[PDB]
Symmetry: D2
Amino acid sequence: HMLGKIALEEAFALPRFEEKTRWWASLFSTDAETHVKEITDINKIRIEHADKHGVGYQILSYTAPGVQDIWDPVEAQALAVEINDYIAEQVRVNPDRFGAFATLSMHNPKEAADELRRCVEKYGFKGALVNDTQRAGPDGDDMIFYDNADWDIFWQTCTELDVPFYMHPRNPTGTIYEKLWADRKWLVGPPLSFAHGVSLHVLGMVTNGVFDRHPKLQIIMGHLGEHVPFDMWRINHWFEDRKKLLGLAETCKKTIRDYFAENIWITTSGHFSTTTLNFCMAEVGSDRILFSIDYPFETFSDACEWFDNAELNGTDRLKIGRENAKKLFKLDSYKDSSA
Amino acid sequence: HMLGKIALEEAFALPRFEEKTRWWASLFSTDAETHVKEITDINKIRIEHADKHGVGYQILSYTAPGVQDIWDPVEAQALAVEINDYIAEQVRVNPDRFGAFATLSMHNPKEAADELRRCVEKYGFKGALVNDTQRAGPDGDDMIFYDNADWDIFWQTCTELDVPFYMHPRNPTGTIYEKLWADRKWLVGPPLSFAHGVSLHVLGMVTNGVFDRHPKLQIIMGHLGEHVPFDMWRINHWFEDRKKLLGLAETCKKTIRDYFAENIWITTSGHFSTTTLNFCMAEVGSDRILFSIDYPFETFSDACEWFDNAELNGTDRLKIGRENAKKLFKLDSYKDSSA
Amino acid sequence: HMLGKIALEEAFALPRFEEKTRWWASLFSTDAETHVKEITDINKIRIEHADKHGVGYQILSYTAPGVQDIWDPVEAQALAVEINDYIAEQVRVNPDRFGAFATLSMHNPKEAADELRRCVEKYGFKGALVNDTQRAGPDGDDMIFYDNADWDIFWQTCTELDVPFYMHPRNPTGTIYEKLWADRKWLVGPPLSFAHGVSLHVLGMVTNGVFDRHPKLQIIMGHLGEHVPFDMWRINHWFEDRKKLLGLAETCKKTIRDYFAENIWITTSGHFSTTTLNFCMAEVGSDRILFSIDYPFETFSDACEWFDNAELNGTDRLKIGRENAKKLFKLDSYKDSSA
Amino acid sequence: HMLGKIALEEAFALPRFEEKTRWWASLFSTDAETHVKEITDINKIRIEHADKHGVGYQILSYTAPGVQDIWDPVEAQALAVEINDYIAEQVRVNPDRFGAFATLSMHNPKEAADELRRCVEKYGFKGALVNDTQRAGPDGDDMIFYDNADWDIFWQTCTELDVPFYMHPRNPTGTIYEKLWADRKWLVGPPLSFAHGVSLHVLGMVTNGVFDRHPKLQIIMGHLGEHVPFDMWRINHWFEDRKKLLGLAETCKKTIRDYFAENIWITTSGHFSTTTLNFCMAEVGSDRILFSIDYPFETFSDACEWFDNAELNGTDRLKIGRENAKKLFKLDSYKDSSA
Ligand SMILES: [Ca+2]
Ligand SMILES: [Ca+2]
Ligand SMILES: [Mg+2]
Ligand SMILES: [Mg+2]
Ligand SMILES: [Mg+2]
Ligand SMILES: [Mg+2]
């Protein structure tokens, strides 16, 4: 019933990466042929789906693992630039229906800062979406986290442009994959490993003071917060009543609840559960929750039939469905934006 | 107000390991001197606390990381035997207040099976409590998981004795620690890493068919299920609607909800949140939730004041507080067991 | 697709009361012709609905206001006897699909007790269902309540036979209707007036000591408890911390939560809300919640599609759907009872 | 330890009505002497409580049953004028701690509108608080409801001044008390009768079109909405899917959820339940929930210790504790308003 919804965990892939798309689809799709067409399509099938399910605006982003899988910094940077140029041309076809997040190589803070700036200033991109850590090292076995002082120049750019950063998952790779996941591989992705990566990274940003140095910074997590709201009580207790008396306070000046009120957002991507949504409204607050889908790994029908029909007060259905995002991303009018 | 409560995530340490106890306390306690005395005491301070807070019975278990930190199999086995002999003598002082879980070396399935059998048949231990994977390899960088066919002999022993297995966390070590945790070390333990280990292991047991080969097996998780109930909807969706059409059904014959109804238990250790408890009652069911404390990392006061005073229907307060555990562990009478 | 569900707020009417049936339908049905057919049918339409929606067993009862609308005691008693004899003959056609509640005139405690006893002993009825207070007095403007010593012989018959009593609503009538409802007539029935009557009556039983004199007595309320769970905290507070220091304790010896654990049941009739069900699971406990429909005022489709597909743990879906009622009504078998 | 909280179901009585005050206290207080002192005090005991419990601002109102108990219209109106003049003088001593609601005789719409207007324009009162229906008729056994066209001039005055109307309960009286309550008298007041009256009246305003004729009108209910949120699903179902196909749509143009998003507020007075608050956050939305106490029938300690320490996200703690009310009542400053 609700129209003008905004979705913002919505992936695309370059047409020239069909092999990579099919490999990823072999893990996460039950219809590879349909998946290939849907993840590459922008302006036809995606619009048909959105027209049928009351989605007015979609903020598109590059599929995982995307650029974060690329450990050669020169190749990674060139791919990020290529993807951003590509999607900017695609969204120009229907700008009243689509915006985009920047795709970044995260090998170098200044390089990523400059490319984010290019995307926002040249193309009007709405923020950045990065698939967790950047693979690095001679054969990609290292990983680059962004929760340290080397990345201050990048987070300062996010706050200067006043745009959010969506911390999306990626698959485990290298030694981590071999040690923890190969022998229980069906847990890779949405069932468990994705959330383990994102929650580690975002709570690393918390405990390493990123939101203290950059109190304006907005970080978004999918999948109703990648487990974190479930342990809001336990994290807060073990911070305020334990670790904050042992040294954590030196690099973490506020409570986990403060950071969720001031800095962190969660979306409903891939987690179409009213019971869990209700629990998140208590632990995080409806003001900090955004509707999203996770297309094409999830269907518009599943996400939108769920949300349109969920038992929910009308105030929060409007906020989660579009008004929260309209404010956060400073959106102009779009289809059914005031319907 | 409720008396005769049962707690079963309650740790002790051997008096001769004071240095190890102090190191662990430097991470997880704000009063090392009191912690040292409390984790070694069995029959005096522990009883004073329990008498003040309506705890009739405690099932004791060895502190983490315990034997799972020991990668030399000969040393590990000898320590497990030592600990079990020690605690059996300690609980004989007040058997109406204390039982114990077996402490095991998990280097070898048959060895662990035999020691569990010794503990149950000789000492009347109530089950096993193991701190996640067993460190192994020449310098302890390897880890032994129990979700495979080599461990069938061990899980068959659990079901033959009809006793549960409590999958407790341990700290990350070796390469995993260096790669994921050293640069965000305040997340080690209760704030995040503990739950990541246990949930991986237990969901590995699920997806590798342990509960299919051993449908009577009962596994217990602390900390309200180590995130898993939060993603019950998402795991079930990505199993039944995705991975089960891609190959998971070959080694996983039931739904995640079936396994929580038939095989898995959660406790309230270290997670004194009525809002989260309510959400777990919806996702898991009050019949599958056990009260516990996590002493001495948590206080009796915190856990028992919370639970005694939580808004809760009287049926579930009695079940979670003691009647669920009385049935699961086939308990004879104990202090206030019918009060 | 749970099978073998039990529903027990399921109404029929005598064919000879068509004019009265059409008047009730003019208030509470959008399709009077289908309503007349459905409320008078026992063994065809009703069975077809149950076959399509996984309902194995239904306990049938007489429509409201029913005998409680009849203020002439002789006419009322003869009608009750007629109804019970009638429904006994009809449910003989499908004893594995139907049981019945006794229909009673509640003008006289001994008369009602004798007729309940005849129904149970002669016909195997499962209990009694009564539409709130009995209309009485010259023109029916008086009300007979059952929460007093005159009714002890009746409550004792319920506990002796060990069958429950379903306190169903009826419409407001006479001076009460004129004074409170006529100027806001769209609130009559399920929107408000029904719950106001039942909660008054049942909380009257509580505060007048009925469950103290008859501790084994089981009372069932529909519609998730007619508001009472919403105020569980508030009622308990204003009893234990206020009124029970001013005189209530003289006739009310347990807490409201005690009575919901020991004496009171709620059903899901006409209240197909998972959010509200979850809240009742917290305030009342899943052990004390029964599935029901409220057919034909509600459809099988609405009730069963909601419950079959509600997000709920498997343990509580089985209990609420059938196992709670199977135990309460001592059902050893019926269609799909162990499906 | 949230400071600057706003409470607004906070009662006073005139010193000259001591006998009436002691009678009300005999029903609803366990300490009559303290009650008399607290309900008549404005500027000493009340301020001390607020200083100790983080309440910056209180909107005071006259005790129930108040002017609504007075069936002589001339006496009732003179009493209202007296009360408003009185409380205006008392709150001048602490304008950064107190505002007031108008006390009204509701015998005549124009008379009430004129007195509300005098209170707002002359004294800066914040709205009106009325104890349900106005007693009227020879011996006060009649009731005046406000959900009809006669009261349009009054509702228009509320929207013109842009101030809300608090529908507070009163005791049942006369024939209604005798017929429904006298034989179960411990249910009178907070346990049940209060909510039955207020929900009847407010849902009467809904179904008689008051919010359609006056879409800007704001109505406040105490006690987490007097049961209505519990039946949000059921009311909405029986309106939109039943009664609105039989005639309700002629005088009721929006859904019940619409009216709770646009016109109706609930407060936490006398209902210090986080479980129930969470449920109301789902059914009503945190934006429409206001903190309040119900002093001196409830203590500051109970209300404020509950709310200050409730598990709640930080965003909603600030909104419910003060920011919602700050916006509704256009408060630019008061003690600790931005603390
Ligand atoms: Ca006919
Ligand atoms: Ca005096
Ligand atoms: Mg995604
Ligand atoms: Mg522990
Ligand atoms: Mg019914
Ligand atoms: Mg009040």
